[PDB]
Design a protein around this nucleic acid. Sequence first.
RNA 1: CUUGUUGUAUAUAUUCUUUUAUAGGUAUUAAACAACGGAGAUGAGGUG
Length: 739
Amino acid sequence: MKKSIKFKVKGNCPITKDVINEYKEYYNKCSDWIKNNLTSITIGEMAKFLQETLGKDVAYISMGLSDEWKDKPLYHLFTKKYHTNNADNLLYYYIKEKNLDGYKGNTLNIGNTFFRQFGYFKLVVSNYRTKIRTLNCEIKRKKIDADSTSEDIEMQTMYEIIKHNLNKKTDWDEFISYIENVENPNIDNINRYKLLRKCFCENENMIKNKLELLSIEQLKNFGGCIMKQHINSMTLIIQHFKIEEKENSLGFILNLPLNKKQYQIELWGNRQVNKGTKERDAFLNTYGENIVFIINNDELYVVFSYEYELEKEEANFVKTVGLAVNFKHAFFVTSEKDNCHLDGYINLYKYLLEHDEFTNLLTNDEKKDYEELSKVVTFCPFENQLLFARYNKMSKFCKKEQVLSKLLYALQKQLKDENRTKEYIYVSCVNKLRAKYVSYFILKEKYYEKQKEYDIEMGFVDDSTESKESMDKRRTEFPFRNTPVANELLSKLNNVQQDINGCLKNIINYIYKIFEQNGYKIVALENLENSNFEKKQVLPTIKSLLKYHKLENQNVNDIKASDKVKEYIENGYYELITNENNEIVDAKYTEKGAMKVKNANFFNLMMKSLHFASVKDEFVLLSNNGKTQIALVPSEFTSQMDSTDHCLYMKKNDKGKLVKADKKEVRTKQEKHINGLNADFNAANNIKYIVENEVWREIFCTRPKKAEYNVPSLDTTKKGPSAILHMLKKIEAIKILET
RNA sequence: CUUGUUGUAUAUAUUCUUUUAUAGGUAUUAAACAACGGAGAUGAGGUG
Ligand SMILES: [Mg+2]
Ligand SMILES: [Mg+2]
């Protein structure tokens, strides 16, 4: 259906930076008003004032005084239930007849409806509507006890809904069922959910009104929708503009009518819209009405929107592959075995094993691990532990990161000289991804250090001498984000992340094209989500070590907080400085501990930065035009089931219910499953079987209706975790775990 | 108009940057292969 193209202007064009600046100022004032009145103002007062001023009884004005929306907050004009155009007209005429946007014409005297009613106000309404319909609040996990106020209980009651989607009584009951039926885990967490159920269904509607009220309050604090100073775009609706191909050129001409005057904007051609292609015909035959103007690095751009027909193919089920996405060791392990059958595939773990400068520093365990990986089809030999040796000068794993990097870069030069460009781009983007992640870490932790300096220089100290009422205001009135220094770091981070995204797309394109050019009609990923990531446990901070753990006053001989804290004291993580009482009053972060926290952060930050949960979206996008199709498998039990015999190990408690075992009851310390296989090779094989096997393909893979943009050919079922457990049990996917 | 954006050089000069240092900034210098539905500048941790 819809689709965009962007063009650049060549030379003469009346859309200067001042025009976009004026449009941006109008947008920002209007959206600032809407932000400041998202909830305080009532729709009823607006409609009554329109009754006072105009007096008409049109549909939108009548809907303002209807009993459904008479006293609801203004933000309901942006929800799903409220009629769209009625809200548009009501809000528009309210702002207009009060001159709250401050409109005083424009530079080029564009039509008032095309610049104000259908322009920046249209964008403001569209953007606020988009956000409020997908409100995403964020709350912390405060410890829940019997002694707590209703709000303290409720805040965590709303928290669990946010993190796990427990809107319904069914959603809670299917959740308690799951936890109690694996390993018989800690009773304390189950007690929490039981208490919340005693407090969730008690006040369901109140909780539902909350997490909307709170979500909006978390929207008027993050700035709402105020266009960021680096963007500088401008969207307009124009009625009779035409676009024609430039004469004797691979360009286009825009015939924009402005101020009743027929202008002419010269453009450059896009290779997207190159001559003779179907995309050029579709663009020129059916291009929309909305035009966007952007200033991107001191240059102007035009965005149009045309409509096309996608011809996405359908699932074939002849040659399938599962891709496990595990960031530890290789980024992309498949279900395939590296029998040198894939065309245009370079196995980098095999390349690292032929050389001896590498396998002379590797212990007997590491040799077996690397040689097990080298037998399978892997991709992007990211080594999170080795890569951290670049940042850690005193690392035990240094001289391994130097040899690894040198050998990889030497292979890159060899690939350049032998002219294998497909693999050359892959390896160069691998090297640059590894270096750019270190750059991202450097810049993002300079961001955090600078933020801490800013907090302790603006009086945002946790030790505060001001009212908490003022602190929240200033945290919003002058946050770190708006400061000039942060925009420098955020710009550098945007450049680095742009390189990261590009190199990641090059690697993903490489994998997809290898799978497509060999004949793999389906690629089965998993419905991975930010909950499927195992984050390394960061050490307790300075604040938490003394205050929560009550270490602020106790002797070294006195260890009552926890045993794990005592283990942290055993290693040189904290430097506990004794006071005159020989009990720890001042605490430190030791350089060993400082570099431990850095290792934890270095591993954890790979989730969002390297798109842990978006390595399926790019694969789907590559299938919108390719021949390989993408199948999403439920992100559970795939990395917990024996690949040789497809069964979930389960143990019989003496109570008498066959229940699954611990996630570590099946994994040893090494990345080897109890079936004697690499964990990722196990997980990848399981993924494929849930597609290869037709019965399992119908049980968990719910086929969408037809081919659609941005949609996999096969999707996971909507059944919850406990439903998936029982259905496998109902088909005898069961193995007794002989402990 | 060999035409737009992004990715991809471990390139020459560099009394530039440790806030991109196996990389960037400024001068250049060189190349094809790709993708492109506008895009993505929102939080770093502890006992669960
Ligand atoms: Mg770049
Ligand atoms: Mg280029």
